Design a protein around this nucleic acid. Sequence first.
RNA 1: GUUUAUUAAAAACACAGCACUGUGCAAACACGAAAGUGGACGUAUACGGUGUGACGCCUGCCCGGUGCCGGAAGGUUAAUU
RNA 2: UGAUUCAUGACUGGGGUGAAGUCGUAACAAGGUAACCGUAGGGGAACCUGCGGUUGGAUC
RNA 3: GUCUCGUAGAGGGGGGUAGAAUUCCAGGUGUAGCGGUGAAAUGCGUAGAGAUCUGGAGGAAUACCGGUGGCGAAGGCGGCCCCCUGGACGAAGACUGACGCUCAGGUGCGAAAGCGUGGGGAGCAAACAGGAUUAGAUACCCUGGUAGUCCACGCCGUAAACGAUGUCGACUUGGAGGUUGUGCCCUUGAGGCGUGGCUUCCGGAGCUAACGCGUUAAGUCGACCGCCUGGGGAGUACGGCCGCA
Lengths: 117, 271, 69, 55, 88, 103
Amino acid sequence: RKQVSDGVAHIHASFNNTIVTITDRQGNALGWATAGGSGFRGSRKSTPFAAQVAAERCADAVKEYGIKNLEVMVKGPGPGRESTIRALNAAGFRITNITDVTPIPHXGCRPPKKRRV
Amino acid sequence: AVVKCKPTSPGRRHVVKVVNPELHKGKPFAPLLEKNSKSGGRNNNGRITTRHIGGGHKQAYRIVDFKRNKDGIPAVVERLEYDPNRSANIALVLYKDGERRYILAPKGLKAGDQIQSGVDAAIKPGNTLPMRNIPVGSTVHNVEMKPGKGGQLARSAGTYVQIVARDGAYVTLRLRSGEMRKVEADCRATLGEVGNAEHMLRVLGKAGAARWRGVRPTVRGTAMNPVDHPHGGGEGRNFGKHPVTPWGVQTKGKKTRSNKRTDKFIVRRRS
Amino acid sequence: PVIKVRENEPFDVALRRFKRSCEKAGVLAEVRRREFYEKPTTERKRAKASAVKRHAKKLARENARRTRL
Amino acid sequence: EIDYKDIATLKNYITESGKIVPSRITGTRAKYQRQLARAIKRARYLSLLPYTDRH
Amino acid sequence: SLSTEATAKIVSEFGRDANDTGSTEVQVALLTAQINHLQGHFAEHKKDHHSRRGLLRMVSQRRKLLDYLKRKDVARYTQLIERLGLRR
Amino acid sequence: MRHYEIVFMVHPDQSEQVPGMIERYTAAITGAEGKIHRLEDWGRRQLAYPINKLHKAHYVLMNVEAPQEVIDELETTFRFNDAVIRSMVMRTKHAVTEASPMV
RNA sequence: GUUUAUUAAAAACACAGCACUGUGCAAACACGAAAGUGGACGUAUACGGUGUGACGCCUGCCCGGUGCCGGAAGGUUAAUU
RNA sequence: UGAUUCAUGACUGGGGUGAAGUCGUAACAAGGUAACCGUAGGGGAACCUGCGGUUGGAUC
RNA sequence: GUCUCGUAGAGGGGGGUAGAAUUCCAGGUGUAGCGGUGAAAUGCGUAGAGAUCUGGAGGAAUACCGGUGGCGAAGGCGGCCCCCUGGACGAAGACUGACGCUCAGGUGCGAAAGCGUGGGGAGCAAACAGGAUUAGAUACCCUGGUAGUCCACGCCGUAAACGAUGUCGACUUGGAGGUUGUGCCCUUGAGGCGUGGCUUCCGGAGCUAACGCGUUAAGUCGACCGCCUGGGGAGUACGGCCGCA
Ligand SMILES: [Cu+]
Ligand SMILES: [K+]
Ligand SMILES: [K+]
Ligand SMILES: [K+]
Ligand SMILES: [K+]
Ligand SMILES: [K+]
Ligand SMILES: [K+]
Ligand SMILES: [K+]
Ligand SMILES: [K+]
Ligand SMILES: [K+]
Ligand SMILES: [K+]
Ligand SMILES: [K+]
Ligand SMILES: [K+]
Ligand SMILES: [K+]
Ligand SMILES: [K+]
Ligand SMILES: [K+]
Ligand SMILES: [K+]
Ligand SMILES: [K+]
Ligand SMILES: [K+]
Ligand SMILES: [K+]
Ligand SMILES: [K+]
Ligand SMILES: [K+]
Ligand SMILES: [K+]
Ligand SMILES: [K+]
Ligand SMILES: [K+]
Ligand SMILES: [K+]
Ligand SMILES: [K+]
Ligand SMILES: [K+]
Ligand SMILES: [K+]
Ligand SMILES: [K+]
Ligand SMILES: [K+]
Ligand SMILES: [K+]
Ligand SMILES: [K+]
Ligand SMILES: [K+]
Ligand SMILES: [Mg+2]
Ligand SMILES: [Mg+2]
Ligand SMILES: [Mg+2]
Ligand SMILES: [Mg+2]
Ligand SMILES: [Mg+2]
Ligand SMILES: [Mg+2]
Ligand SMILES: [Mg+2]
Ligand SMILES: [Mg+2]
Ligand SMILES: [Mg+2]
Ligand SMILES: [Mg+2]
Ligand SMILES: [Mg+2]
Ligand SMILES: [Mg+2]
Ligand SMILES: [Mg+2]
Ligand SMILES: [Mg+2]
Ligand SMILES: [Mg+2]
Ligand SMILES: [Mg+2]
Ligand SMILES: [Mg+2]
Ligand SMILES: [Mg+2]
Ligand SMILES: [Mg+2]
Ligand SMILES: [Mg+2]
Ligand SMILES: [Mg+2]
Ligand SMILES: [Mg+2]
Ligand SMILES: [Mg+2]
Ligand SMILES: [Mg+2]
Ligand SMILES: [Mg+2]
Ligand SMILES: [Mg+2]
Ligand SMILES: [Mg+2]
Ligand SMILES: [Mg+2]
Ligand SMILES: [Mg+2]
Ligand SMILES: [Mg+2]
Ligand SMILES: [Mg+2]
Ligand SMILES: [Mg+2]
Ligand SMILES: [Mg+2]
Ligand SMILES: [Mg+2]
Ligand SMILES: [Mg+2]
Ligand SMILES: [Mg+2]
Ligand SMILES: [Mg+2]
Ligand SMILES: [Mg+2]
Ligand SMILES: [Mg+2]
Ligand SMILES: [Mg+2]
Ligand SMILES: [Mg+2]
Ligand SMILES: [Mg+2]
């Protein structure tokens, strides 16, 4: 209920889904939306359009806080890397910063075995 | 060294000895000896209160300095010795002022080494300090639980404790059991590990070797009659019941700690 | 890739700059190659094949630059 | 000789994210590229240079 | 592993002069010094197979030089093995 | 008798103890017939990344020629000194006396 | 090695070895209205309980039932009020 | 009392040949999960799976 | 073959340390999904997951540099720092004086898996379980997951352990590169002229059944060793030796 006006949008763009979480600058979440939760399943859930719809829903969920400025942190290789940012800019927020925070081990743990399809 | 006996008799085929050619071969230091006669596991009502104890070799008690509070005066290790009373070896040490004491022997300690205790002692194996003055992450043994009470934790051969953290008046310790335990930082501890780590590799090899150590035979409850043990009975080998002690308490996982007074110091149980 | 949108900079320009910086950093290819474990023999085989292909293509280009169609 | 304390020189051979730039891009000789990599790793350890740009 | 000073001392002690670095006695003495010195290294590092290969090469080279010296001049060979404390 | 380059970083709250530590370490080196080729105090610098939640540290650089025993003792002192947050000892081919790029 | 003193000496009991499990020390546990005592002037490479029974090669599937261990959002529920 | 050699033995192990009956389709094309080597575990069967190795892999 | 000066190098053994990331634990914000696939389901989540921030524990591996790049007898070796230590190469000399080459038997080293004892265990993952697919699916796919992978010591002694090419030496047209030394010259630098070591690709003569090899030979010769003699049975049986198996 307290005004913030300075938030951070975290995009978790995986191959199967997009999770958009808007927090304040201290990392406390204010609202979230996901492509899977915005009425998309299966092959439709992992599209840029579903990610854009999720970004719009997250903006609507955080509308009460009166956020004006947004930093953006994108993590993952998923197809919803840029549609979410485009929707966030179209929703009226002022995109101040954009940063990639995809984790990269510096070697790290052994990955799962290759799939034989 | 760990030495396998040759099978010249069935009772020697499986024997494995721990042979240390550094222990003193002569007699112990007499002024630090006391007699200690045997109990057979019986209390002052004359009743057996711990089963399976009796006989075995006569043993003199060595007075061991677990407090390590003779501060500021260096001592030199004179010799290592066998102590029948414990798994660890002990070391006879001579202080500069001419006083002799027994200490638990840390791993690596040998005759001629120098040791010291107190707040200003060097961080070296065999030296004793309050844990307030020992670096976090260190390995220590013979750890006090109350300042000035004397060492009580990690005394058995090969054992040690890890100082994992230090917060305010307390340190957190990883014990050999796996428990994480808070202890006052004013409690003392000796640097290093208790020696004689090979102790657990010995193999007794025959029944008599347990009898030499004062251990009497265990009789299985399922080998008894019902009047004797909840497990007893049966025409043939029968069981059909949840395993219990001779007094009826479940004995395969049921927990028995109940100490609300000391619960506040257990950061994390061993499991 | 840290792209700070400067004043009076359009969002489309900022997005294109971010995309270019990500492509130059090559994070996507790194993630894709780290998704599953590659046996060391497989990695060596792939590196050798890429080097052989590059050299053979360069030689073929050199030969084809001196002929008429 | 490359000095791990020569931060100004070393910064020419790292990217914006802090990665070591390939010698095929910088035009550096191989023998000096190896010294550059060693110096950069030492500087990273001494915290004169960052491991990653997310610092 | 041998230092310059130790090498020069061995050369002076076993050669005709300080320039006699090539004599069989000098070579054998130098190899003996290196082998004895490495004994301590391999007492501590029992799994240093790669270095031990170089040590075994010194041993074989010394054996071949000694056999050559024995074939050529028996008296020099006897004096050298006595001085160096070698069984053969 | 080998040549070493020693860089150690002090917690900024203990910056006032830095001259004392420098004097003690140089005295320890010179006691065992050691030489100090170079000694620089870089003061407080901003760290490229946080260390123990800090963001600045007091840097000291030395170039000495000392026996291995005293070098090992110095490393032990660094390890057990709570003020020194990070140190680094390197061998150098020769003595270094010229001014570093920091100064 | 032990055993039914007095019809059973054995394939029974024990046994070194193995495993599960309890136990952070005023230990668990046991004798005891209690004070205390044994465990132990021991301290997890230690001590108790249980099963198996040198050694060699081994020890597969089932947690639905009974027990033990963990959980605590909900339902039900004692004295009390 | 041993050694060696020949014959023989309920039963049992795999092998070859013939013939094609039952069960699948492992390999040859990228053989439809690239194949193969050593090893280990599993499976009516060809085989499958893990770990390292090879190219005597198609496409790129 | 020895000595002197120097050079490059993931060569080996021991110890320490750094940052990224995964998992787990605790707490803050927050709310209905997460995860997975070709599509699903099993699984996880209102007992508050997933997401995000903070702190802690722990193991394993070292992004970028990085390269038909380097080192090593082969097997193999990759963050940084120290300690111990093996080999190679180059320039001028000085020294010894055939001290050499090869090697049955012997001995040593020898990936991964596996074995023994004691530790450790994050991630991965034989076996195993469930969900799918299918006619079936003891698989391929999914969700989990134990040995094992890690450490110390010992054993095992095998791999398409391959260049499917034994070691040593001499000789025989060329081109373009990589890497690492060193000499001389100039207008002094991505400079020019040489001379060594190792290495990649192409190709001449010659060789070869052909494919191809081609001064790093599969060309022309010498020294010594190992090995083959139609396919299957079979690298199997029996016997010996070795091994805990
Ligand atoms: Cu109730
Ligand atoms: K004892
Ligand atoms: K028994
Ligand atoms: K019974
Ligand atoms: K019975
Ligand atoms: K009976
Ligand atoms: K320190
Ligand atoms: K009898
Ligand atoms: K009996
Ligand atoms: K037990
Ligand atoms: K046996
Ligand atoms: K046996
Ligand atoms: K059950
Ligand atoms: K059950
Ligand atoms: K209740
Ligand atoms: K016969
Ligand atoms: K017969
Ligand atoms: K197949
Ligand atoms: K194939
Ligand atoms: K296989
Ligand atoms: K079947
Ligand atoms: K070296
Ligand atoms: K390391
Ligand atoms: K020979
Ligand atoms: K193990
Ligand atoms: K593990
Ligand atoms: K898995
Ligand atoms: K080792
Ligand atoms: K084997
Ligand atoms: K190959
Ligand atoms: K060259
Ligand atoms: K040159
Ligand atoms: K063997
Ligand atoms: K075994
Ligand atoms: Mg997956
Ligand atoms: Mg298919
Ligand atoms: Mg009485
Ligand atoms: Mg008992
Ligand atoms: Mg006793
Ligand atoms: Mg027993
Ligand atoms: Mg009976
Ligand atoms: Mg009863
Ligand atoms: Mg019966
Ligand atoms: Mg029954
Ligand atoms: Mg009962
Ligand atoms: Mg030499
Ligand atoms: Mg009797
Ligand atoms: Mg009778
Ligand atoms: Mg009788
Ligand atoms: Mg008591
Ligand atoms: Mg009591
Ligand atoms: Mg008592
Ligand atoms: Mg039995
Ligand atoms: Mg259940
Ligand atoms: Mg319960
Ligand atoms: Mg086949
Ligand atoms: Mg097929
Ligand atoms: Mg198929
Ligand atoms: Mg196939
Ligand atoms: Mg075979
Ligand atoms: Mg299987
Ligand atoms: Mg753990
Ligand atoms: Mg060297
Ligand atoms: Mg041979
Ligand atoms: Mg292995
Ligand atoms: Mg097994
Ligand atoms: Mg093992
Ligand atoms: Mg595990
Ligand atoms: Mg799986
Ligand atoms: Mg073979
Ligand atoms: Mg290989
Ligand atoms: Mg072959
Ligand atoms: Mg080479
Ligand atoms: Mg060619
Ligand atoms: Mg031919
Ligand atoms: Mg065979």
